[PDB]
Design a protein around this nucleic acid. Structure first.
Lengths: 489, 163, 107
DNA sequence: CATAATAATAGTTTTTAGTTTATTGGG
DNA sequence: GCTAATAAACTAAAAACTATTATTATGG
């Protein structure tokens, strides 16, 4: 399943968007530009399968497809790009505001129905599948309808039209944040995020589709259609793209085998695999090697049920995954699987199976820990019920350790470090850390793509502090440290 | 190979501990080397990559004039190896420091990744470190907490937070 | 065609937006026959420094080329000829250029 | 052995298993 | 007293989803 998400930015530009607004800081325009720039950066680092656009209502020099009055379109629906970032940042700050005034002006008449018209036209413009559409609109007007009520009625009609079409609009306080003083009129049929958007959290990708719809074969007769769903993947930087120094042109890389004996070229068919063992040069075929890697057909042949005691923390392998029934070519799988899942309190004994994720690969035995339905009171189902794909290590997977033995230590040190670690308690949060390398790489990209003077070095929570935990624990860490002759040299 | 690292907690606790690879996906060292079928010689097999531009005659270009690029949104930004090396940064040395402790109930196997079971022993011929480690192990056993550590194999290896 | 001397010489036009737009500077250099390249190279005689950036910082760090302000380029273009090197458009220069200046300038 | 047809084949993109760089390692 | 089992890329990754074109079972 693919589909592009769209978010369109609409901001007032007539008179109240370039004012102090009962403040001494910058006009709403400046940090509105900052916020939309932040969401541009977040989207760029997040996903490139989405389109964004910017339109201003209130216009002295109109430019749009339908050529209405007081309607100006800057950037249409398109994937965000560095040139878009430059275009947006050209109109940031006071210098950006005055440049905008020089090339755009201010002080026209809003026409909300025309805005809805042009935004609907923009949505019609894209030829891609629209998974989701969203409109945001920020202005200092809680009710800009002191003008003719005909315009208000037409705007309401167009809002109903776009709601029927599936378009949703967003507006929130800008003039007087807080107090529920905004949307005096828009509260009828239209339903703070400033910090959330300004936080511009990035370096997060998004899942598009699952994988590996496999069969649970309990026997040679009955099968169950299920799909293995990932939940964690080791993220990494996008692969480098080979380019030409002079022209920054993509390079048609062309790798091939060759022979210096005759200067000709070898086909992938006449090049045979070879091995060396003992006193012989073992020769093999590529297809023979592939068959050697092949053991049986992909599937999940149930092997039995093993009590949830053989699993040990020190016995671990490649990450476990999630299993969900998928009734696309076998029906009745979902109901039976659900019946199995709910009966887990008695089914503490974990299911045993040998796993063949894909074709022509050796199978690994994998236990199936029944996942639970951890529904939240906020109606959020975290980790829906299923099975854990815990991999069982083989006999050859264990490396022998020295058999040095140590006897129990004194309990007074045990108690003193018990107090130490109890005082030094850290509330673990699963989503509380990001890889410094990847986020730093993203900072470099966003930096060395604009005309940025120097890069920003985002502070990570991974780096241990020097004294914050020490003061959180006090000096008792050294006061209680009564070990004789510390191993320090 | 032993991994003797100064287990650092706060600013005073420094414990010499060596890590060892215990459970891992065993990989065969020997792999099928490619030889010609009619001579079984790897010396007459030249594996090479040719770099050419998007040209009508696909003009070949050297390896020295290559430059790394990355798909940045709707564009590609060129980087050089020295540039990408100097812009990146990581903590140096054997970074193994505990960031605190929490209840074992907070952590669950449904958030486990990696493929290394790195058993940790004490130092060599230092019974003070061994007794300290044993006491700490028993303390964790009593309190049933879990240790969160920002682990780095060395200065060159990328930092990895874990438990 | 303005100066065939600047031909056969590669100029790293990697930052041409100091004050004037980069394409205008590139076209004028082409009129002088210089070879426009977006990245430094061993055959590149000099690197044009426009807006100061992190890449400019790398070029300074990488003692491989010369960090020349557009002022020397502006003087060359206004005079329609080569302008001798005055060590005030320079930021970071190769040891060869260091020795050249030490030859033609005291300190 | 024909023609308002018809569909069961293909084709673009996500993510794992292949191999080179580099550092502790003696007779 | 000169031959490391390291793990950054090695190298080109058996993947579906959502998009169109060739067969026909049949009007004739």
């Amino acid at each position: 399943y693919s589909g592009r998400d769209s978010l369109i930015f609409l901001v007032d530009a007539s008179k109240a968007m370039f004012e102090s607004q009962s403040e001494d800081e910058l006009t709403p325009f400046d940090m509105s530009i900052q916020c939309i720039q932040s969401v541009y950066i977040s989207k760029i680092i997040s996903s490139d399968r989405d389109l964004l656009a910017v339109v201003f209502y209130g216009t002295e020099k109109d430019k749009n497809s339908v050529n209405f009055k007081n309607i100006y379109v800057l950037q249409e629906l398109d994937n965000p790009g560095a040139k878009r970032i430059l275009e947006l940042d050209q109109f940031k700050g006071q210098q950006g505001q005055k440049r905008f005034q020089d090339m755009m002006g201010h002080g026209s008449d809003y026409s909300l129905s025309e805005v809805l018209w042009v935004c609907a036209n923009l949505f019609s413009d894209v030829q891609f599948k629209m998974s989701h559409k969203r409109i945001m609109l920020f202005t200092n007007e809680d009710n800009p309808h002191g003008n003719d009520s005909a315009k208000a009625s037409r705007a309401r009609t167009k809002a109903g039209d776009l709601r029927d079409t599936g378009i949703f609009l967003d507006l929130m306080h800008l003039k007087k944040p807080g107090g529920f003083d905004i949307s005096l009129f828009y509260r009828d049929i239209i339903s703070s995020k400033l910090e959330d958007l300004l936080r511009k959290v990035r370096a997060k990708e998004t899942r598009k589709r699952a994988l590996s719809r496999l069969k649970l074969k309990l026997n040679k007769d009955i099968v169950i259609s299920v799909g293995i769903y990932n939940l964690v993947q080791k993220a990494l930087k996008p692969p480098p793209i080979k380019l030409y120094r002079e022209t920054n042109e993509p390079v048609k890389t062309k790798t091939r085998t060759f022979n210096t004996s005759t200067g000709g070229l070898l086909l992938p068919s006449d090049t045979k695999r070879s091995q060396i063992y003992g006193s012989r040069q073992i020769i093999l075929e590529k297809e023979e090697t592939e068959e050697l890697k092949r053991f049986d057909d992909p599937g999940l042949m149930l092997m039995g049920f093993k009590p949830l005691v053989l699993l040990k923390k020190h016995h671990y392998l490649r990450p476990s995954l999630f299993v969900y029934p998928e009734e696309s070519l076998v029906i009745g799988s979902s109901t039976l699987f659900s019946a199995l899942l709910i009966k887990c309190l008695e089914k503490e004994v974990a299911a045993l199976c040998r796993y063949t994720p894909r074709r022509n690969i050796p199978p690994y035995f994998v236990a199936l820990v029944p996942q639970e339905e951890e529904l939240d009171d906020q109606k959020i189902q975290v980790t829906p019920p299923g099975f854990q794909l815990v991999f069982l290590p083989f006999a050859d997977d264990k490396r022998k350790m020295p058999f040095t033995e140590k006897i129990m230590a004194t309990p007074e040190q045990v108690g003193k470090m018990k107090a130490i670690v109890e005082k030094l308690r850290f509330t673990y949060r699963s989503d509380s850390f990001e890889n410094p390398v990847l986020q730093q790489h993203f900072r470099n990209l966003e930096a060395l793509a604009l005309d940025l003077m120097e890069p920003e070095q985002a502070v990570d929570l991974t780096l241990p502090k020097v004294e914050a935990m020490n003061k959180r624990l006090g000096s008792l860490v050294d006061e209680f440290k009564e070990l004789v002759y510390p191993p320090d040299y | 190979i032993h991994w003797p690292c100064r287990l650092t907690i706060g600013s005073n606790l420094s414990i010499r501990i060596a890590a060892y690879k215990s459970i891992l996906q065993e990989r065969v060292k020997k792999t099928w080397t490619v030889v010609d079928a009619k001579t079984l010689k790897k010396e007459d097999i030249q594996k090479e990559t040719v770099y050419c531009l998007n040209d009508d005659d696909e003009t070949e270009v050297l390896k020295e004039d290559i430059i790394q690029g990355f798909r940045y949104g709707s564009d590609i930004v060129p980087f050089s190896k020295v540039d990408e090396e100097q812009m990146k940064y990581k903590s140096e040395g054997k970074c193994f420091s505990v960031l605190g402790f929490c209840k074992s109930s907070q952590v669950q196997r449904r958030f486990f990744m990696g493929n290394q079971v790195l058993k940790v022993f004490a130092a060599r011929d230092d019974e003070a470190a061994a007794v300290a480690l044993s006491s700490l192990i028993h303390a964790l056993d009593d309190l049933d907490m879990v240790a969160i550590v920002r682990y780095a194999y060395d200065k060159r290896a990328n930092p990895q937070v874990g438990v | 065609k303005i100066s065939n001397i600047f031909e056969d010489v590669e100029f790293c036009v990697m930052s041409g937006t100091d004050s004037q737009p980069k394409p205008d500077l590139e076209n004028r250099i082409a009129e002088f026959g210089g070879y426009i390249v977006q990245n430094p190279g061993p055959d590149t005689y000099c690197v044009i420094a426009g807006s100061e950036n992190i890449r400019v910082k790398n070029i300074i760090l990488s003692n491989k080329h010369d960090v020349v302000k557009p002022a020397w380029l502006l003087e060359c273009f206004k005079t329609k000829s080569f302008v001798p090197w005055q060590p005030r458009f320079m930021i970071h220069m190769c040891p060869s250029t260091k020795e050249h200046f030490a030859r033609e300038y005291d300190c």
